[PDB]
Amino acid sequence: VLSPADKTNVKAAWGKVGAHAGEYGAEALERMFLSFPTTKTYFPHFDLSHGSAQVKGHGKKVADALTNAVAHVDDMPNALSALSDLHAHKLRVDPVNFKLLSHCLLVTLAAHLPAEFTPAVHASLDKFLASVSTVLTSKY
Amino acid sequence: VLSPADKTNVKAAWGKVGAHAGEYGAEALERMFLSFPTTKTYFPHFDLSHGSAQVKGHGKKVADALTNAVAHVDDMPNALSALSDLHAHKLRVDPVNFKLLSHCLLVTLAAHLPAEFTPAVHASLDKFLASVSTVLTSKY
Amino acid sequence: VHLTPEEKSAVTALWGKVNVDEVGGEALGRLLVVYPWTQRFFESFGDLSTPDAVMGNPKVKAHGKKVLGAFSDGLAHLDNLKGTFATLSELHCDKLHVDPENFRLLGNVLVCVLAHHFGKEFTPPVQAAYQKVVAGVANALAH
Amino acid sequence: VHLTPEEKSAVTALWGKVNVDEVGGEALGRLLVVYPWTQRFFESFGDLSTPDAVMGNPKVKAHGKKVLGAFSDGLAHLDNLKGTFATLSELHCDKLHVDPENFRLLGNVLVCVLAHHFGKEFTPPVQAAYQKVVAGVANALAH
Numbered sequence: 001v002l003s004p005a006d007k008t009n010v011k012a013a014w015g016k017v018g019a020h021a022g023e024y025g026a027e028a029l030e031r032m033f034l035s036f037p038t039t040k041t042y043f044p045h046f047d048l049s050h051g052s053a054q055v056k057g058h059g060k061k062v063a064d065a066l067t068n069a070v071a072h073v074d075d076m077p078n079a080l081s082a083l084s085d086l087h088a089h090k091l092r093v094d095p096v097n098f099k100l101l102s103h104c105l106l107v108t109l110a111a112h113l114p115a116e117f118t119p120a121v122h123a124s125l126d127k128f129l130a131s132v133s134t135v136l137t138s139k140y
Numbered sequence: 141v142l143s144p145a146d147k148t149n150v151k152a153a154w155g156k157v158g159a160h161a162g163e164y165g166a167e168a169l170e171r172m173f174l175s176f177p178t179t180k181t182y183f184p185h186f187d188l189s190h191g192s193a194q195v196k197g198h199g200k201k202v203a204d205a206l207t208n209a210v211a212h213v214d215d216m217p218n219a220l221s222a223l224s225d226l227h228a229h230k231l232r233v234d235p236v237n238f239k240l241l242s243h244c245l246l247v248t249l250a251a252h253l254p255a256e257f258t259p260a261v262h263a264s265l266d267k268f269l270a271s272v273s274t275v276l277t278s279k280y
Numbered sequence: 281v282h283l284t285p286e287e288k289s290a291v292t293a294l295w296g297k298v299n300v301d302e303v304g305g306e307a308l309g310r311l312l313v314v315y316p317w318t319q320r321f322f323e324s325f326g327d328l329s330t331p332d333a334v335m336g337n338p339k340v341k342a343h344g345k346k347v348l349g350a351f352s353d354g355l356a357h358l359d360n361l362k363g364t365f366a367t368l369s370e371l372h373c374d375k376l377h378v379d380p381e382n383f384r385l386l387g388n389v390l391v392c393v394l395a396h397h398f399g400k401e402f403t404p405p406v407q408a409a410y411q412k413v414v415a416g417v418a419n420a421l422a423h
Numbered sequence: 424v425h426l427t428p429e430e431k432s433a434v435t436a437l438w439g440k441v442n443v444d445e446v447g448g449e450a451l452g453r454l455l456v457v458y459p460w461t462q463r464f465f466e467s468f469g470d471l472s473t474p475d476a477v478m479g480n481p482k483v484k485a486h487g488k489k490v491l492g493a494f495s496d497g498l499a500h501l502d503n504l505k506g507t508f509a510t511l512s513e514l515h516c517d518k519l520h521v522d523p524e525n526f527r528l529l530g531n532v533l534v535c536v537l538a539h540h541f542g543k544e545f546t547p548p549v550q551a552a553y554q555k556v557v558a559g560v561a562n563a564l565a566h
């Protein structure tokens with residue numbers, strides 16, 4: 001459940017990220033792979049080294065999916081249906097891994113938006129990421 | 141997300157529980173308090189000893205709330221709104237505790253429905269309890 | 281796992297009654313059914329496209345035996361789980377890369393299987409002692 | 424917490440730059456804001472009805488100092504966290520009855536606060552070393 005305040009906070013913050021969306025997504029992934037090495041086993045076929053074009057490429061897809069969910073915050077289940085099907089059914093992603101990636105995305109934003117990452121904005125983004133994660137794990 | 145199969149499984153199982161609903165709720169609570177003693181701190185004003193009228197009384201309320209959610213499985217958010225408001229806002233229940241109580245409710249059912257608690261029914265009840273828990277933690 | 285004498289009593293008494301050929305396979309089987317992501321570490325085991333499939337699947341039962349085998353060990357060495365499970369730790373952690381939360385899940389499924397098999401005999405106090413055991417075992421594996 | 428020399432290097436260098444009077448209060452404050460159930464162990468601290476309230480609240484800042492105080496300790500005794508945090512364990516566990524998951528949350532909030540303060544300096548490798556530390560500290564507290 002996202003409040004009208006959360007929704008504006010998340011929009012604001014994504015507004016501030018602007019065109020760095022893809023880049024921050026990639027950085028979030030690298031943070032995840034380094035801090036939580038078990039996550040890497042879902043990407044055996046990626047090169048996960050720093051500067052990897054595949055990681056960069058993937059961070060852009062992840063950031064686009066997040067923006068699509070912000071853009072349709074009121075109907076995320078529908079917006080994210082294909083993706084939740086991919087993650088639960090085909091990929092078999094452990095739900096715990098969503099918490100880890102969510103955390104790294106918050107860390108990334110904190111590291112890049114000193115003014116924007118207030119306690120209230122932190123809380124709103126955490127809720128948004130949790131809602132996205134809920135949708136993405138809803139199809140088991 | 142509950143499937144048509146899950147929904148019938150949960151109805152079936154609750155059908156089998158029948159009028160023991162209250163009693164099983166109380167037993168689930170006792171299991172929770174004994175196995176996970178940190179949960180007790182939310183009930184400082186209850187006597188939590190075996191046979192406690194307050195535990196019995198509370199198990200009936202918990203079982204009724206669950207039946208109400210089964211009875212309105214398709215609109216749980218609305219059905220459970222007052223309860224999610226109580227648990228998140230006033231009571232400040234740690235979301236982790238929902239997993240613990242859900243587990244004890246499954247244990248209780250397993251202990252009382254040998255024929256009914258098949259692997260498929262287990263999975264369906266686990267999903268139902270998780271959905272209930274999601275609603276009950278949705279208002280932070 | 282700091283079991284009291286009565287906690288040890290409850291765990292031991294019930295455990296002698298356990299069919300070690302079947303319970304392990306039931307627990308592992310239920311894990312893969314209830315928590316489907318877990319199937320990802322077991323795609324080599326064959327047909328897992330249904331409960332009946334998973335449940336009635338020989339590689340599942342087979343492996344469950346070992347799992348339960350390992351658990352019985354830990355039951356003998358309650359006062360030293362870290363040492364007991366030192367080998368298995370570096371397997372699921374360093375070799376298989378399984379998240380620790382999943383050990384907690386297996387333990388809880390096991391508990392549900394014990395409840396299923398023993399019914400009324402699996403009392404709240406008996407359950408509480410067994411939660412201590414699976415928690416200790418999960419932690420030792422996580423180390 | 425088995426830190427490599429480079430992990431220790433990264434943790435130590437950054438930590439000397441930390442304002443120990445403020446970061447602790449920021450971390451605890453953010454915990455109570457982002458994860459509101461946690462306010463339940465702190466109802467004695469006063470006005471928590473808003474972020475600005477929590478953030479600009481003296482009992483919060485005060486306590487955060489100790490918390491961060493305790494964390495700096497663990498940073499000195501990386502090779503023995505269990506012994507270091509033996510006293511604090513039996514407090515949050517036996518006296519306060521806080522769930523271990525909440526230690527993980529505080530650690531992650533701390534990490535977000537470090538990222539906030541250090542920006543680009545809080546690199547992915549630096550973050551990874553700090554996750555090892557907060558994990559070790561959380562586990563020691565859970566014991």
Ligand SMILES: O=N[O-]
Binds near residue numbers: 029062
């Ligand atoms: O990395 N998320 O696909």
Ligand SMILES: O=N[O-]
Binds near residue numbers: 169202
């Ligand atoms: O015990 N659930 O209120």
